[PDB]
């Protein structure tokens, strides 16, 4: 049994979201399973949206009901979800989940298989390359045995970027933080911590690639 969600990936606000869940290794018609759509906003928990039963009966989360339509095509082994006029709050991973059961006990039902999910990001942004900024210590904080440097990757769209230090040769003592969407663009940061005698004596450079904009920049961290 497999479930696979597909969607647009990115929409602008006010656009219509159309999702599809494609099932295999079993038959929607024969099995008579129900199917739900469930979403998860980034770093948040799970929210049930809608359910469709084998006979096309439907239930909705009351708070989003006016904007939701669930349907299906039993002949294509697909369930669909539409959400009208999306805005920022709709940015989420959307999951398809089958409500399976054993043999004949249709009342003993549960979400036995879930898709991988499809991510939706709602933004008015065009593709935008990041501004990459080297973060050197304050003109003072290189006493003590270690020194921490950073790199700020600001104002890009969409995800992802790839960030390395010294083209990946500097990998221990690194923390690269998840991107956050704010005001339609992404910001990410990374820190690297070395011994006080490593820097600035040795060159430490932040490397940032943004596939969508076909860009690759290096920023050496220099003393202020």
């Amino acid at each position: 049994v497999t479930l696979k969600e597909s969607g647009p990936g990115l929409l602008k606000p006010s656009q219509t979201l159309s999702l599809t869940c494609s099932f295999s290794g079993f038959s929607i018609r024969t099995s008579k399973v129900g199917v739900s759509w469930i979403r998860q906003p980034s770093g948040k928990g799970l929210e049930w949206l809608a359910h469709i039963y084998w006979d096309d009966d439907k239930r909705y989360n009351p708070s989003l009901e006016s904007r939701l339509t669930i349907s299906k095509d039993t002949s294509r082994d697909m369930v669909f979800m539409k959400i009208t006029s999306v805005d920022t709050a709709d940015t989420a991973t959307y999951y398809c989940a089958r409500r399976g059961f054993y043999g004949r006990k249709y009342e003993v039902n549960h979400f036995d298989y879930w898709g991988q999910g499809t991510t939706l990001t709602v933004s008015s942004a065009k593709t935008t390359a990041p501004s990459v900024y080297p973060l050197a210590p304050v003109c003072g904080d290189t006493t003590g045995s270690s020194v921490t440097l950073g790199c700020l990757v600001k104002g890009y769209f969409p995800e992802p970027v790839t960030l390395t230090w010294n083209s990946g040769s500097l990998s221990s003592g690194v923390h690269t933080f998840p991107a956050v969407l704010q005001s339609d663009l992404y910001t990410l940061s990374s820190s690297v911590t070395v011994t006080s005698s490593t820097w600035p004596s040795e060159s430490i450079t932040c490397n940032v690639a943004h596939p969508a904009s076909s860009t690759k920049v290096d920023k050496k961290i220099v003393p202020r």
Partner: protein
């Protein structure tokens, strides 16, 4: 509609020990057919949710015998008899007896470890960003434990709560600590109209806050 209250929201455990998680419903979730549709799901990092337990206490095929569920009516518990590394993640209870079907907020099962103080580092806006007319001040709070921490920004000695983007990593694979980044973004003009910039961290490892500050003029 039915509120599902999970206790605790964070559960540090030592590997090989038992874990128990409580889920309380706001009303009875026994269905009109007399079944109680109370399920437990695990979501590992970078994975979809997976079913563990259904109908309060039935283990789903393929789930390890370490997992068990109990309860009745409005009070339910998931137990893990011996926690293994691959059990770490977020556990959700879920009722499907009443529409809208509703989840708990989630319980993060994590690895217990010794308290560790954060290493706190503050970074003025780069010269290059200032040529743009925005200015971001960055503070890293690295390798701390427990996860509970407060970060405060102060500009000219007064707390600032707008302009802020925080981001966190998960428990580290080498040392089981957490790290956090906070970025305060102003206009270049506003940055240059003010003079002291401070990131203050409150963490159980110190009675006093950790204060990292700079003066723009220096």
């Amino acid at each position: 509609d039915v509120l599902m209250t999970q206790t605790p929201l964070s559960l540090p455990v030592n590997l090989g020990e038992q874990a128990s998680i409580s889920c309380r419903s706001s009303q009875s979730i026994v269905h009109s057919n007399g079944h109680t549709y109370l399920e437990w799901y695990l979501q590992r990092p970078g994975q979809s949710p997976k079913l563990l337990i259904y109908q309060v206490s039935t283990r789903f095929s393929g789930v390890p015998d370490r997992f068990s569920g109990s309860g009745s009516g409005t009070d339910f518990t998931l137990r893990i008899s011996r926690v293994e590394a691959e059990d770490l993640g977020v556990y959700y209870c879920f009722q499907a007896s009443l529409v809208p079907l509703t989840f708990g907020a989630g319980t993060k099962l994590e690895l217990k470890r010794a308290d560790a103080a954060p290493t706190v580092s503050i970074f003025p806006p780069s010269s290059e960003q200032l040529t743009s007319g925005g200015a971001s001040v960055v503070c890293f709070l690295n390798n701390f434990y427990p996860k509970d921490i407060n970060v405060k920004w102060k500009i000219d000695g007064s707390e600032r709560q707008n302009g802020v983007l925080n981001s966190w990593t998960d428990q580290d694979s080498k040392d089981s600590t957490y790290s956090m980044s906070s970025t305060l973004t102003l206009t270049k003009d506003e940055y240059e109209r003010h003079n002291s910039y401070t990131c203050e961290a409150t963490h159980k490892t110190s009675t006093s806050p950790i204060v990292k500050s700079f003066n723009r003029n220096e």
